[PDB]
From a paper:
In order to elucidate their role in the lytic cassette of [name] prophages, we cloned and produced [name] from the PBSX prophage and [name] from the SPβ prophage.
The three-dimensional structure of [name] was determined to a resolution of 1.3 Å by SeMet SAD phasing. Comparing [name] with the C-terminal domain of [name] shows that the structures are highly conserved, as presented in Fig. 7.
Residue numbers in the entry:
A (entry chain B), B (entry chain C), C (entry chain A), D (entry chain D), E (entry chain E): 7 to 118
Write the structure that this text describes.
Amino acid sequence: NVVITIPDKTSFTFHEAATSPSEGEEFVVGHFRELTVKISGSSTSREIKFYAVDENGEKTALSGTNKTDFQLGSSTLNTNEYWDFDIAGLFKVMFEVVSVTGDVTVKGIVVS
Amino acid sequence: NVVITIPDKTSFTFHEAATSPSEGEEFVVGHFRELTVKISGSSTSREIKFYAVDENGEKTALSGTNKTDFQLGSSTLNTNEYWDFDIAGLFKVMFEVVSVTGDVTVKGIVVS
Amino acid sequence: NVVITIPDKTSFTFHEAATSPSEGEEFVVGHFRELTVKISGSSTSREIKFYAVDENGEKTALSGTNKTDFQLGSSTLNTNEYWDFDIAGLFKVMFEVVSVTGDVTVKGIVVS
Amino acid sequence: NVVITIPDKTSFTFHEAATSPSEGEEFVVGHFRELTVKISGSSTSREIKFYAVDENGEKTALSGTNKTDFQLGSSTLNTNEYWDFDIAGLFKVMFEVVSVTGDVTVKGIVVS
Amino acid sequence: NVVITIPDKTSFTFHEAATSPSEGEEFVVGHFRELTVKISGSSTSREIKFYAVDENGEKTALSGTNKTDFQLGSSTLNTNEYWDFDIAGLFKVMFEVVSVTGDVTVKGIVVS
């Protein structure tokens, strides 16, 4: 029995147009394996910190890979970036806006 | 229950025989995970820039891997090359012909 | 025949609030491929050693990847960390509390 | 609904007992993802060049990984070697015997 | 149509209690992708060489990754070690006991 395999995917908004600091919305990983976050908006400065969160709400800095230059990091000071993360073994993920001047949007696509 | 698994694949033409600068056709990623782009044609010079595009049309430089030498890059000045990309968490991808003297074809095979 | 594929996942507690040295509970890998361990609690100091265990009970130091900084290691002196392991070819895994001052929890999520 | 997943595999002969230069047979990749080539025989010298080939017949040097030493390359002067390739995004692959003294066999196993 | 995916696994004994030099038993890869070999026993010295074997019985040194320290190698002088191999494109694999004083067991778990 041969089957053609495709992943499940969904979208999630962590921040829809943050203009002040916030932890934003937390994604429950469920059955997904990978996350790509897009950082967008018209800010002139910002800092986003990337976090894994467990069932008790403890936050742990989470490294991912920048799709522009393959750099590794657990935060960014830039906008117009995609960051890839391996999330399969995590309960929840969170993308904190530490600081922003203007507006920053943080949205993800998750893949099983 | 044991199943033999195979990927879904399709072909996509970004540029059929570009002779002038163009963003070309955008590929909506859908359920796919990986893309291999072939840059072909007959040219003296050409420049192809690789982009991810979000739902608002923002373009982000996208790095891939050259199958000939495993070099990383988000653009190329060469023809007769395959470039591999991880696209699973992206909305769309675009391969811009910034310039061509002669003609350049840009075609992909996508894999789930 | 097209199928959407998702992994199996489960959770496992190696140590539910260790305050003295212990090997803790051993996880039978079964059909799983990957493990992510979270080291948590309010301990002021601890040492966790990571082990693969075979069917005869022989323990072998097992390296994994720290999700905060991508560092490799077979042990840690830190709390609030995730460690990723490729376990597909192992019979059992074990996370030994070698030492602790305070309480340390060791819990994993496994993925097929 | 839980399924046990296994790949499709097949074998392909690029060269059965080449004693003079030849492009040999081309493999149409179809639904396969990976290729491992064995270079065998009693030749005393040879040069094999590894190619991806598109729908127009353009040949592109294709790097793979030597399973003995993890070296990368797009050709070999050696015999008794396995080379692994990621082929999922390619139309065809070809292994050219550029030169040979004696007999060289080039056979692959492909995996979905 | 959504399915939860798990691998096929199997076990294989290359050597059950080798006390003198032997090539041991050959595993036919079949539909499997990844192999983890455990080297165990009470030997005080030993040398194990790792091989791929083709349909004609030709042996090729095969590199794998030590799970304790991520070191690469095609042989070992140590006991109490796991070695991981990518075997998907191989016909057969063999683990030769070149020498041993005492007993060495060589067993694998294989994953699709």
